[PDB]
Symmetry: D2
Subunit: 247 residues, 4 copies
């Protein structure tokens, strides 16, 4: 019903897949949405596509300086952020024996410390504008499953959940909620181009319902968590995977 | 925007507290709602209060015969149920040493086997009408916490989550989701009559946010789970307690 | 090193499979072990097999009167119980549509309320003898997985975990711990004689390690929980399934 | 009865507190133990104290080069490692608003990526020697609780559990188990010197049992996980906190 009218949400890694699917929904919810991504072109293509409520600002979540610039510009245009959706991440396919310290470090830096960098700045910004924000970080259900071929990723995602829980309590007093969502396999654009695409049949088997997971499936849940209906929920993780795992 | 228009939802223990708060919200969602309760007067007082969307049918969830009659009548009026909200339960305050086999049996019979009796009939009804239903059972976050003075209740609630998970996979093939919600302390008409009321200050301390939990807090989340936004969620438990526990 | 010398442990459903495997181990730990079972012959065959550390006493965990008689006799012989292992349960294979109220009730009564009946009496007995006991209840990892063809069972097992958590806090002040173990598929006698036996190849696939689960695998863990090494652990659930699920 | 005789175990951060308590116990189990720590003097003081089964080798878990040197020397002396206990970590007390990118990075680097660096090398070493190893990583129950004043730490520890789960499946085929333990508040030498010490009375309240947590409490559990009794357990987290949280 355009419940999010008047609100400003930021989505990272929003140039495609789930991030984009989310930005699109929040916009449909009436919010003005900052489509952020490391891919400046994709970001602004996506915002053009979303259209009007959507504004593109490129940023590398793992770089402190571009994240500062990200938020500065948001403050200017909107006076601050009401909703933060930590979506940007690297989704690797790496056999255990290919897991380098180098690989490890990159995945951790983006998927994990990158989300702190942004959350640090974003919550500071809500706090400064006296807004009762919502933080929502996209994790993964690989954390519950111990999925193979992506150890650094599962660690980092474990990290994001840890972070989420501590943050919830850390920010409760500022009326800011912090939650996480664990998507199962989703037919984003990242997966379609990923060895991971080959796993749909096997994960479908393990699911209680039997479609292929779709970005809108996660977007529609983020939309709820960003809404007032989810006001009494903080520190929780929503698992969205057609019953792959039970949480 | 009345997304639940055309749908029929049944809420048990709906004469007051959370059940009523839920029936009220689902009606606001546009659904026609069967307000069911063991307290026939309260049920029908509550449906009068709700509106023309609400209809009262009294039933003891722990009695097979009254649950049969509950559903028969629903089939007649509506051709079947789309949404099931297992809310009816007994919320005891019993010191461990007062936990009788007798007390144990009563709590288990209603809070647990009573929810099976209804779910059995309700999902059969959806199934028979070829409706892609939603089951939502109200558990409790005492299951995560191991809360004292209510051991039978915590077992039964553990049971409802167990049930929920198995059911999810059991019904996935008929396009029926089954989920659960674990409310923390809520200032219901029930609680207000309980010694439990005295615990608000302590639980508020442990919460990340600092209000007293309110029935509308849980109703608003049930409303989401009943909606299409939650279509990719089955077998999961939503914990709603202002950050009391982290799930 | 016979750490359990001087201690008295009771194992229910101990005539075969895991219960027997456990009684055997606890006896090897030096404990005198009451082998209890509904099958009087099996129980006492098993105790004969185990040695002179083992004594057989038949009992139906779901019957309050035979449970009373069970413990009275134990008090006489040993002056009370130090360790309680709730093992006795019914392991069904029932398609959802065969799940009767009748089936439901039977499974709940034994697997769940039966374990309360015994735990009530057992912990009272420890308490009365001023013993700092250990309660250990065998659940199942189907509770984490939402395994199909056994809905009543998954609910009851959910219940036992609920019970366990509440009990931990309930008895902490009497220096009594209460824990639970969730075995995955185990090649016990009942499994071998049950449509469940056919699932070994599939569950082996999902396991991180690739043997068939063996009763000694669970017995060896119970032995630990019954020991002083596990003294700071209460309210927890040990999941033992070669990595089927991650808990 | 010295079950760990013949085995070689490495413990990091083993100069004091839990690490030392663990090294001591594993040695008592008969294992030859590498007492590793960033504090070379503490490490070798601790091994002198422990005994002749204990050997000290200093190393910074967060530095790849010293970790290489750590394991090379172990290979020389023992032909490789059978058991790995990731204990070394930084236990901070930082108010949210003091959480720097700089602070964040340090905690993540040691507590999380430092445990990868060691696990990478250690498991490679077991693998190379054809040994069916055990990995045990000490996390924290703050991950379940969302404890405040230590957000970077709670994230990292979340990460260690993530890592653990993925690793379990990653190494199951080489007969190597990987588990984690979540200690609650423990009265170690670090904690005694931390503003965390002041929290004992509060955490004691929330505990089901009411002592102050002791390093031996965790050591005795690690000992079990290192033993054959825990051979069917991989990808699991043992929570040891006197019932603070229920896992
Ligand atoms: N899609 C899945 O099946 C899968 C499963 C579970 C969870 N997830 C999570 O969902 C989210 C979206 O996944 P997806 O599959 O849609 O991803 P995707 O690969 O389709 O797109 C991710 C986007 O993130 C951006 N990005 C990468 N690094 C960045 C950084 N340094 N700074 C800013 N932006 C960066 C990329 O440019 C890309 O456009 C991710 O957090 C992922 O962890 C994905
Ligand atoms: N209030 C809380 O803090 C709390 C927390 C977690 C979960 N819950 C759950 O929420 C649900 C309702 O909560 P509440 O606090 O509003 O309870 P309440 O006491 O305020 O109302 C419960 C209603 O259930 C009805 N009922 C009792 N037995 C019945 C039967 N056999 N058949 C049909 N109806 C029956 C009662 O008549 C009553 O109208 C319960 O399942 C309870 O377990 C409550
Ligand atoms: N084997 C598995 O795949 C598996 C998996 C998860 C959990 N479990 C649990 O392990 C435990 C043992 O399983 P199992 O396969 O060894 O069982 P089993 O069928 O092989 O033997 C269990 C014993 O319990 C007894 N029993 C049944 N009802 C009783 C009653 N009311 N009172 C007293 N005794 C009764 C039976 O007579 C039998 O001797 C059970 O609690 C089960 O729930 C087993
Ligand atoms: N004690 C608790 O309340 C508590 C609770 C949960 C988990 N833990 C975990 O247990 C472990 C030890 O706890 P503690 O109370 O003994 O802390 P402690 O401060 O007494 O000792 C930790 C040890 O880690 C070592 N260390 C630090 N950086 C290192 C480096 N990079 N390389 C090698 N060693 C390094 C230190 O020298 C120290 O000896 C830590 O992992 C901590 O996270 C502690």
């Amino acid at each position: 019903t355009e419940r999010l009218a008047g609100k400003t949400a930021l989505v990272t890694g929003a140039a495609q897949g789930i991030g984009k699917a989310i930005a699109a929904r929040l916009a449909a919810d009436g919010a003005t949405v900052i489509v952020s991504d490391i891919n400046a072109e994709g970001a602004k293509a996506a915002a053009a596509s979303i259209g009007k409520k959507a504004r593109a600002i490129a940023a590398d979540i793992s770089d402190p300086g571009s994240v500062k610039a990200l938020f500065a510009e948001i403050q200017a245009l909107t006076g601050g952020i009401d909703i933060l959706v930590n979506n940007a991440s690297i989704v690797p396919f790496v056999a255990w024996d290919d897991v380098d310290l180098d690989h490890w470090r990159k995945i951790i830096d983006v998927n994990l410390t990158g989300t702190f960098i942004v959350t640090r700045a974003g919550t500071d910004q809500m706090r400064a504008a006296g807004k009762a924000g919502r933080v929502i970080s996209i994790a993964s259900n690989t954390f519950f499953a111990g999925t193979p071929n992506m150890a650094a990723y599962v660690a980092a995602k474990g990290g994001v959940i840890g972070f989420t829980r501590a943050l919830a309590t850390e920010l409760g007093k500022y009326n800011i909620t912090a939650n996480a969502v664990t998507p199962g396999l989703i037919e984003s654009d990242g997966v379609k181009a990923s060895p991971h695409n080959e796993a749909f049949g096997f994960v479908e088997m393990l699911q209680a319902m039997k479609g292929k997971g779709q970005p809108e499936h996660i977007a529609d849940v983020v939309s709820f968590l960003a809404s007032d209906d989810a006001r009494w929920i903080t520190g929780q993780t929503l698992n969205v995977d057609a019953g792959m795992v039970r949480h």
